[PDB]
């Protein structure tokens, strides 16, 4: 029955959204150019240890406009797309909704191991089907997350050359570290890595490395352990690469903080027909780069085999393991609201039965072979948040304010027609800041946003979308972040103490980054026009639409002339239309400051705003409402000019501007 | 609803423009007659290294007018075309628009590559059998651009034969160089080329000339690297010429400016099924003329196979690459800028999967073997700049003038007849000059200077039209060039950074070279009418057409007699209105002054314009306005005779005077 | 819609082409008569080593005509069908199109070996089906190619008795050869055989000869090697013939050039229940002819067993192995264009599982028992090239010329109506000669030629045609030969340095040999009449048809009288038909030499051409065009005589002249 939603769904159906594969393909070979700290500049020589948690790899992107039929030269602006580079956070949470985490079927694994046991004349108890079903289900999720974390550590330590590196393994096993010193790759305030050299478990009778080992003997009882069992052919257990991979995972799991080493035990047990090779813990430098590369390759082979040869869920989990190191930064004052609310992945302890006799599918382009896995992982997350922003900002800007007299009056007290009546919330500042979860949970579950978010995600991903939708719904439904009134200043990574209060104390909780990036990527874009090419503005009507609550970002003429004209091109005067009592026209800004307009004056003397060229804050919600105003031009018919805009971003993809929208 | 537009479209339909094949046929095979520095005379013997960035081959072409009735004979003029031939310039930009650059389709590279990677690949990495992960982007552009640059080097060395020669390979690599000295060629103030001797990269395990190498065998591993992969049979990889071609391409890629080198890395790397042939790294005198030529041939075959055997876009990118070192030189003192804003080709770092087994086609005459490709590329560019000229001028001269204390809100003042309302801007001089992309873009979007461009380019090039069109539009959008108060003096390559000054402080921004060449080549030409044969001229009316906002060039009845005795032929008097009021008349020149005329007087001392002969500035706007004039005759007849003009130029194409145009009848 | 093609298809359907079996049957017992060198004559005593790479076994065939009602005696001509005899080339290339190489199904092999392993209580890992599918597919192609090469070596060394032979094995194992000397059977410039005595691999623990050996033990682990596994019953591993055959193949594989010994490794592993017999490398003369014959027989038995008992694909590959020694020579000046472009066979490395407990099908007439396998192999190739020529010359002679002013003018510049407009190509001589592949690739893929070539091949071969069609399309699509302007002189085998330029510099790229052979064999013949029996010529109309571009080879009267009349039987005069201005009739030869005919003269004084009796070059393209000419006879009605022609070739088959054609 809703017309607007039907129109949007029809348009989305007619113009399909860009498949994820293009976005993956267009980043596999991207060479970063800037590794400066977010705030300052790179010092002469790199430090010896990753300490300043402010570094960022900057994907520069430039936009400059021109006023056709004029001699004005607007300075070029800069779409600063920042990727956090040294900062640790957690993306694991044991809390799932029904579709959040699935159970990979053990259809092709049980028969093979059954036949193996029968062939080697091992006396087992009970048909393996029911014992598999009840004793040990099949959740290999964890072992991919650790792999992603390892790749992320490698990438981080690679980009930031710490002036005398050792190896992937020498900075990971903590050789020559004081009992209180932190690992080289992660040494700064509020890190998330256990400190000191990691300690190998004691050498027991039978060991295939850092995990237990059980061999199957002809005419001999066989009993499985309690964790996960990975049957392998004897040709592999004696391989160097396999054991090196196993050791690397073990090391990565004993470095994550102490308290998650007792909730997600890294339990595994290799089973085969060899003689227990025993653990051979590498001690001195003996894991050269080529050996580590082989280890990673064999490891990915085993992982892909465990996932029923899916390579899509595996890629998703491997990525979700990486954001723990690489995150996409915000581009607004009150940021860290969307990313902080969509990061968690529901998980279950690792257990079940596996079988690997030989690889079957040859993944051409795995994650770990990309030019820089961190960037590739971060960009996919950026896409997720972009779509989420698109769905959220479907019916307004969703403001939240801190008015002291909050109880005395209800909502819609201050926000005129601009903020859709129903999306403005307030809270008195006497109490602590509310929980963002409260607002977002109510936002997501409305039918209008649900029925569109589902379609968008399905178009982007496909058969594998439902996992992502369920997981994001869970995460947003489970977030502890508060809407703190402070500001971020957009020149840091973590909120600095003593920062000033927000603008008008009104946080806006849709924005995460400019929609021009979404347009370029070819993904769903919110109701903002794409500043792409030639435009034909008309300052009068354009300006009039602004004072009805519209976003200034949709007004090209004003932004172009913000300080080069508009003091000699347009005037503002009260409306004298009827014969009734004359009234002083007034307009209300965001903070409820009713502004009167008595004597007609040049526009620049009535309203002001900073000139960011043509990249202004999208949803700034400048003018809530205005009544009784007229706009007359005082230039001899040169207020309807044309402008040109060029956006040569380096992350443009095939579907340049073919993505859907709301206001084409 | 535009009579002019429909008339021009119908005309262009009537007389189709000459497709480029005639231009190529004409220009392909003549050697230059004489090459000299633009300003001065060539020395006795050429120096060691090309070091003055003015040498330009020129192409003489003259006009002689002839008629009886004048006092003395008219001296002839020399309309000659020049080619820069030494100076360097960038041509590659990262910006893009929809049609600016397209990705080819790997519909005939995937079958073979998959069937060759499925068999010869250790039987423990699993069977691939998906033919869907092999979908990397196909952008084999930069290879052609580098190929073009290499051809340009060869041609530039050949034309300006230096005193002590060196093998093209030796000059390119530059073994016997200094620490940071310029290459043997391209050694002057504006030169932009990585100095120093070229450095071979490294001594790795898997080498196959300059680029990386990966093999696919049982006792090995396979991992396709990230850049481009050129899958070839073991037969050719062990060949000789192919290795030399790879070395040559690498060599020319490392002479680009260091920053641009970093932007677009040479990421080629080959994969095959045989042992890696170690890099050879030729030095001292390994490569020689014939071996280089053979390598060029095989390289062209490779590139053609990479392009899906298109050969029309291949030639396009090759031309654009060779254009960084050859280009037409402007002819008007204005400063020659129309070219500077049309020279950019969008690009993206090379990538994709390529398979090469055979030829699949044979092209009778590829660009790289046509007797100095530089000249043919330059003229192939000129034949497009002229079309752009024709389309812009479709309305009027489109002047841009300078006035002090101009309103910094709008810059559109009406100048009078002969200058339509849209054009004719103005700008304060004492502030930095405008950007000159704030006018062209506004020009080429209107649906009158767009459809004409569309159909003209369509007729010139045919199916492969859009690409050129799209690309040129992009060039206009982002061009940093600016209008300047200086002159080229007609004997320079760049403005002498001194104090040349404009005669009228204005600039006409839509003229690049005389339309006579456009007529001769058969391409579209506008406005100015052609002058090659007998003509009936009526001074008494042609002059009238002049003072109401014309240009002298159309008025070949005046230039003939400009100072041959036009004086005692026609008088100008204010007006003889037999009724209301005897007011006086005046005219306004391109400057502001409005000096008036009161009584009958000979014309020679009321206007008194400079006499070049029968080749005057076509868009100079000699007079803007005039009201109240009569132009009485002062001799029975003697103002209704005949005139014959002969112009012979060496580039007369096949269909020379059978092209479309819309000049006044 | 095309009428000519429909007519040809209808005629082909109505008159089936000759089955290949007749051609095979009519050569099994052919005794060659001439073994002279191509150019000169046999020396008194044969040399001691095969050095002159010019020898050829000549299949003489004679044709002589007679002029009924005349006293003239035309000398008999000679259809010199030459078979190259000592020259090495390569017919292997790792490049395949989709249908080029198939994968023989292992349907009847896996179950037998499965049952064997189960019976002998060997502990194997994993069901053998999937391991066969992924670990090792079933491509036995190579092992047949080596067999063909071995047979070819035997035949070559047999025909050319080198004055003191040793044995098949003594000239193959290189006993008593200097470390730089070449093998006796192949010692000449640009050979293709590795030199010096071949070296046996070191004697390891278990060996069944020159290849690894693995025995299956009760209650003992069994792991397969990486190459091909050939399970055999124990009764055979201890046989002498089997091991001798294995040794012979090993020797033949280590003699092919060095660089193809690292791309096609001869990997094999015998598996059985015997005790490893160990390698017993024959060292001194100990392989007598009867022992070698038994070896060859048992070897063919094993091969046929490996090929799922097909004997057709096996025969094809065995033949394709032989052309590496025996090839069919050209019969024109600019030859070595068709054969050089249709020789390659797409291949994959040898691997998979096999099983041979006992032969099942008794091939009555294998290749190696023919009178001379080389000749039989060469003739089948000759048939392939003959059909290919037939399809190519379906719409003209396909000329290629070297005109200096090639760029200035387009094609069809010189070739009048004779050369079908669309089949003439030119290239300036400044650049090197073009690649023949470019022209042939475009020729083959036209629908008109494809739809006829497919039918012809299917009729000739049958169910096994698609392999041959796909393989020839691949080969022609992959050829490195250039159209070199030089000439061959038809009295050599390899182009001699310093040979003179071609006639008019115009190579014709359809001809490989006279079509009379194709007619005799009963295979598809191009648009040339078969000179078989009584003919009723009419010199006037016949001559007129010539000057419209037709082929002189279709004009019997002219050829018969080329030098015995035509100076007193027919005159040429300009046509004075209308009242318009008289014009000098002219005709244009191949090289664009416009020839004027002003005053009527005897024919022999206006045009000339060499007299080859009645065997003239078929597609010589004598007269491109002529306009304004008349032909009047000056003999009292004896210009319409009859002629008789007799063609008693020794390779006539059952379908003497029943094959299809174009101009019956």
Author numbering:
A (entry chain A), C (entry chain A): 37 to 700
B (entry chain B): 37 to 701
Question: Please, what does the article write about this entry?
Answer:
Clinical Tv isolates are frequently found infected with one or more strain of the double-stranded RNA (dsRNA) Trichomonas vaginalis viruses (TVVs), belonging to the Trichomonasvirus genus within totiviruses. Here, we have determined the structure of TVV2 by cryo-electron microscopy (cryoEM) at 3.6 Å resolution and derived an atomic model of its capsid. TVV2 has an icosahedral, T = 2*, capsid comprised of 60 copies of the icosahedral asymmetric unit (a dimer of the two capsid shell protein [CSP] conformers, CSP-A and CSP-B), typical of icosahedral dsRNA virus capsids. Among totiviruses, the single capsid layer is responsible for protecting and sequestering the viral genome while facilitating RdRp activity and the egression of viral mRNA into the cytosol.
From 2,034 micrographs, 2,493 particles were boxed and used for icosahedral reconstruction of the viral capsid to 4 Å, based on the 0.143 “gold-standard” Fourier shell correlation coefficient (FSC). Like other totiviruses, the TVV2 viral capsid exhibits a T = 2* icosahedral capsid shell and measures ∼430 Å across at its widest near the I5 vertices, down to ∼350 Å at its narrowest between the icosahedral 2-fold (I2) symmetry axes. The TVV2 capsid is composed of 60 IAUs, organized into 12 decameric units centered about the I5 vertices, enclosing the viral genome. Within these decamers, five CSP-As are seated nearest the I5 vertex, crowding out five CSP-Bs which sit partially intercalated between the flanking CSP-As while extending between 5-fold axes to contact CSP-Bs from two other decamers forming the icosahedral 3-fold (I3) symmetry axes. The CSP-pair, A1B1, represents a reasonable initial species formed within the cytosol, as it buries the greatest surface area between subunits (∼1,540 Å2). Additionally, the interface between the possible tetrameric intermediate, A1B1-A3B3 (∼2,525 Å2), is ∼56% larger than the alternative A1B1-A2B2 tetramer (1,619 Å2) and ∼80% larger than the A1B2-A4B3 tetramer (∼1,405 Å2), suggesting that the first may be more stable and therefore more abundant in the cytosol. The protruding loop from the floor of the dimerization domain (residues 610 to 620) appears rich in positively charged residues (R612, R617, K616, R619, and R620) and inserts into a negatively charged pocket between the carapace and dimerization domains of tetramer subunits. This insertion may act as an anchor to stabilize the association of the capsid decamers through electrostatic interactions, protecting the viral genome in place of more robust interlocking strategies. The interior capsid surface appears predominantly electronegative (red) with discrete electropositive regions (blue) including the protruding loop of the dimerization domain and residues along α1 nearer the I5 vertices. The TVV2 capsid displays similar T = 2* symmetry but does not exhibit comparable subunit interactions and instead seems to rely on the abutting interface between the CSP conformers.
